[PDB]
Amino acid sequence: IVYNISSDFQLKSLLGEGAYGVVCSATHKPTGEIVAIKKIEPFDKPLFALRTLREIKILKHFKHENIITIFNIQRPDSFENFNEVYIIQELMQTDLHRVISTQMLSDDHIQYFIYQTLRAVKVLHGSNVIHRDLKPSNLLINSNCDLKVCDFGLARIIDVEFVATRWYRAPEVMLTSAKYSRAMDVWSCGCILAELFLRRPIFPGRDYRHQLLLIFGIIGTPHSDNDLRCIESPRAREYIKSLPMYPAAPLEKMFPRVNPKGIDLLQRMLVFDPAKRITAKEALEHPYLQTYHDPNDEPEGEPIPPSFFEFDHYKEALTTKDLKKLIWNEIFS
């Protein structure tokens, strides 16, 4: 696993080989710090190029306790042989998926993990950034319990497409065109909070249809004009009537060993109507989290213009060179 990176960096262990590239825990000979180094050969894979670009722009902009820190990107020399991107970021022991899969967590830890995840969402939205793909495995965690969001490969700046799974995607997002709302992120959190209690995905659909069936199977099938009063889609409203009509299930009655307040906050997130869906801010304020809530320390963010990801706004086809230059430029200032 070659790494043509500075001498000062002595690799240690390979933490994961992904579709993106490999990530290794290395040491900063000088200060003796332990960092995470990503090697990414993305130039023949357009999709992975943009993803990497997005991620690099976002990580670098924020300076938040719940969003991963990039320490520095290695700069190449010739744009002519630039075929690898090396990113030195903070090393993180595990992620929220792995943790749920091996430990039972006290209501406190859950309060704290969902608290941190909401804190980050607040700053992202406050900044006009929508993650668009929150799931347990994007929430990295440190040995002392720091949760940190990463993987903004699908992020967007507000005002086909591919996903690894739609297990945490919001129904309004699958049923319509409203695929760039702050609400959709708050829906993912609902799901994440659900997994924290159930220790398993709450809506593990196996395909599109089955996903909705699973969702309504719990929150309830939207029927009247007031339920679909956020689904102006004639098609979406048709398709909904092609699914059985269930009543919302009593989450409280079925999961009685779970903190009643969590259940409330959960219900206020898992709501079909994106407009009645609790917002990250109102979420931090919710009872269930009062222990950790402190409004003088829930950063509101600084707006980021759409031009941040200008590419999302032109039709012009992007070429390979184009992508390599956007990343290149990103690296040189």
Next chain:
Amino acid sequence: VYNISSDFQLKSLLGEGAYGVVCSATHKPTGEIVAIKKIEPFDKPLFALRTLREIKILKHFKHENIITIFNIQRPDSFENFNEVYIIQELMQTDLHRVISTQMLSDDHIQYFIYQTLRAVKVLHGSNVIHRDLKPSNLLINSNCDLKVCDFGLARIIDVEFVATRWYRAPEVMLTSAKYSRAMDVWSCGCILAELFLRRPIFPGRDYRHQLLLIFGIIGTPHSDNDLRCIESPRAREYIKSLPMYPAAPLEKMFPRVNPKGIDLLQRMLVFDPAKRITAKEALEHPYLQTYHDPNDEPEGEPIPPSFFEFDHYKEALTTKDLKKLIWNEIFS
């Protein structure tokens, strides 16, 4: 490794990449030599979708100028479906690399240029546009047979990523008419231009620069009839905002070139896609009467948009969705 029927004998590796290895093999039963691609696209969304298009377009056609795929391996399980073995008709090299490494007689030029427009014609007649033609998507075999492949950006007629736009038509770049049959003729004209020049005629360094180079030879459009087919205000402003140079006389740029070829070049590399000559009209035109033959030239047959149904659903696709598309296409 090449997990495939032992009825094959692997000769040699022909190349690699992101998609995965591809190599020659003998079909013991007929002693016919073939190429077997080993794609591992399910962790690369965009590649799986490209693969899906290639498999559907190729399996469908039966033209001498479109690559022929003989079979596709049958996976015997969805759970463990991680590769795709395509067995297609071996090809020695590609026009890019031929131009790239030799002077070709005006004869050779017409041969390849005829074959190329031959294929484009059947596809255009079948409502299929390639949308990404260039020298390296033109594969050539021994007895100089030209066959087009790489339909990863094709669409059915009733944004995206590309390696380069050196072959993209100006109107596609400016406007949103990124789906005309015309864009393929423009690409064609760039192949032709390149056959004479022996190098890319419009090697732009970037969006603007590409337009600056194209207009540098064809003339910047400025008149209403020039900008007749350009419905966008924003787009018109753009053109009107670039250096405005008058067309250059091809004859004095391709001097050691067949006067009948230039005329064809000028008929293809035209800004107005409406005026632009078509794949059929190109076969007829003088420079190509030596191979023309209003018989041996299929006009194809319209394919229904549903052939590419997925280009009509705005839902997001998942890994499983993708594995399922290719899977169905292999068994159905």
